[PDB]
Design a protein around this ligand. Structure first.
Ligand SMILES: CC(=O)N[C@@H](CC(C)C)C(=O)N[C@@H](C)P(=O)(O)C[C@@H](CCc1ccccc1)C(=O)O
Ligand SMILES: CC(=O)N[C@@H](CC(C)C)C(=O)N[C@@H](C)P(=O)(O)C[C@@H](CCc1ccccc1)C(=O)O
Ligand SMILES: [Zn+2]
Ligand SMILES: [Zn+2]
Lengths: 307, 306
């Protein structure tokens, strides 16, 4: 296989996505690199792709998919995104402008133990796979484990719950690896965490109703990103703060990244709105990724022009 | 034919409905089929009446499959029904139950959703009703009841999994049961079966205030989970809904208990999340058998406390 002969309209295994990363690197040795940022609870490597046309820790966009493993359209879109970047660079003028200044980091399998578990045992696995003493239940909600209103209303203390927060913030190696990488990088200007489903583009906060100081700008960017998105197939996304647009969620990702000074902190909930939910047909992979790419571009151009 | 029916696999809606008919034809002096309504999508809603005679005798209500993706429940409901016909007149304790109490078993309590889980989305939870002014479809039938309806523990968001609907009993699937219970007026036990989590719970889900019958219901719970655990060692916890899982408003047994049905319980069957809703078919029969034993405890106790 090469990245040109790879099937992007199909859901893949952990081993397949991991081999895809290696093909991407070998085919673009002056564009793409693969960074290991940790290992999972179970010992699997956690890998981030860096797309860079030079410099030393340029201002950057971070994008992660697959934090909740069952959300398959997200890792699939993540693969598509990688190949879109390499095809489009040096070819598309607008996108070439983005990558002549910014680096892009892309974490395709952000919850690898879960992902592997969605394949071997339970298609609907959400959480990490860390053990919990005195419980018949396994794993922690990676989207409740960040140090931002951690433990507060909007997560569960019950190990059996889908939204169990863990013993303390960053207890999950899968979250702390991202935290460590982000803090050490120091130059991340936008952070985008990709989930499915509901067709939402959101900004902070999810833990409290109080609006973020950059609300007008973030909301205005949100409206243009979903307008761009809708232009392709008419797909309707709603937007707003996590708490107003879906529900309260504590110790969630963009609440943390935003309080770290990363202004352009966003989360997408992709297709659909419930018909298939997480079980989205493979035939909707590429449409999903393509329309979401239009939204990502909107946000990345904004980031480019607003230091 | 109900002897040759495969209890160790998951069936479509048509297969369950055909099973209802075969069991009635094999046992017409014991089992009758009652239509209590039609779903939002116009499909008949059926309840099995198991009875040895009389008129509106004291009764046990059992439903499965109100959350349609909870496949082990419908599949155990099918087994329960065969089980009743197998033991009536051969097992001395169950004979005594049915000699005094009627039993109603609603196996597919959410037929639209169940059909959807087979045709389109294995993880469909809600009804299939359309929502005025929304793209999203369906109401959580376990939030649509007239007990603390619309209060903390349900969502006003149509796209939510726990969307409560416009008003209490807006879902025909819930109103059919309401109408049935009120009309009957002599249901002494009501047991709603769900999965998963391995829990046995009693009211309330809508508030922390304990029910005046908590002491008795907790002891019965203790007994039922021990009976359950006796076969395979499967560990159930128990308590009020709000303490054993989380707050949930307009939920089923809250309303039943408010109508004066003292023995209102809910089960969450196997497992604890390894497979969740996607429990292997090989576990259907062991789930049904263990669960029957706890059902038996609740049923005997109901019989002995007229
Ligand atoms: C639909 C379902 O069965 N469960 C829900 C969770 C349940 C508590 C209602 C789910 O998986 N929902 C997914 C659509 P989700 O992706 O997991 C939604 C996010 C909340 C929004 C968010 C996203 C990203 C960053 C911060 C906040 C969540 O509950 O974590
Ligand atoms: C755990 C999960 O993946 N999803 C939850 C939804 C929740 C996180 C919003 C679920 O489907 N849970 C099922 C086990 P459930 O079966 O639907 C749990 C009941 C609990 C309360 C209850 C049960 C039965 C009778 C009365 C009250 C519920 O939320 O309705
Ligand atoms: Zn998610
Ligand atoms: Zn349920």
């Amino acid at each position: 296989r090469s990245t040109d002969t790879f099937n992007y309209a199909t859901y893949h295994t952990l081993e397949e996505i991991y081999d895809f990363l290696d093909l991407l690197v070998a085919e673009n040795p002056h564009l793409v690199s693969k960074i290991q940022i940790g290992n999972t609870y179970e010992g699997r490597p956690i890998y981030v792709l860096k797309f860079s046309t030079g410099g030393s820790k340029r201002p950057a966009i971070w994008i992660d998919t697959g934090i909740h493993s069952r959300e398959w359209v997200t890792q699939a879109s993540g693969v598509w995104f990688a190949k879109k970047i390499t095809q489009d660079y040096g070819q598309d003028a607008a996108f070439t402008a983005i990558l002549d200044t910014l680096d892009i980091f892309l974490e395709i399998v952000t919850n690898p133990d879960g992902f592997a578990f969605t394949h071997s045992t339970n298609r609907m696995w959400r959480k990490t796979r860390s053990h919990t003493a005195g419980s018949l239940c396994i794993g922690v909600d990676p989207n409740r484990n960040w140090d931002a209103g951690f433990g507060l209303s909007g997560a569960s203390s019950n190990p059996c719950s889908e939204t169990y927060h863990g013993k303390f913030a960053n207890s999950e190696v899968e979250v702390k690896s991202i935290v460590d990488f982000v803090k050490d990088h120091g130059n991340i200007k936008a952070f985008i965490s990709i989930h499915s489903y509901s067709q939402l583009l959101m900004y902070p906060y999810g833990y409290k109703t109080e609006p973020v100081p950059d609300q007008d700008e973030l909301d205005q960017l949100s409206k243009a990103a979903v307008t761009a998105l809708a232009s392709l197939y008419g797909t309707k996304f709603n937007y707003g703060s996590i708490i107003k647009a879906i529900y309260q969620a504590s110790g969630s990702t963009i609440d943390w990244t935003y309080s770290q000074g990363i202004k352009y902190s966003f989360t997408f909930e992709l297709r659909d709105t419930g018909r298939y939910g997480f079980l989205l047909p493979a035939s909707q992979i590429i449409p999903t990724a393509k329309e979401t790419w239009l939204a990502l571009l909107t946000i990345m151009e904004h980031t480019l022009n607003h230091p």
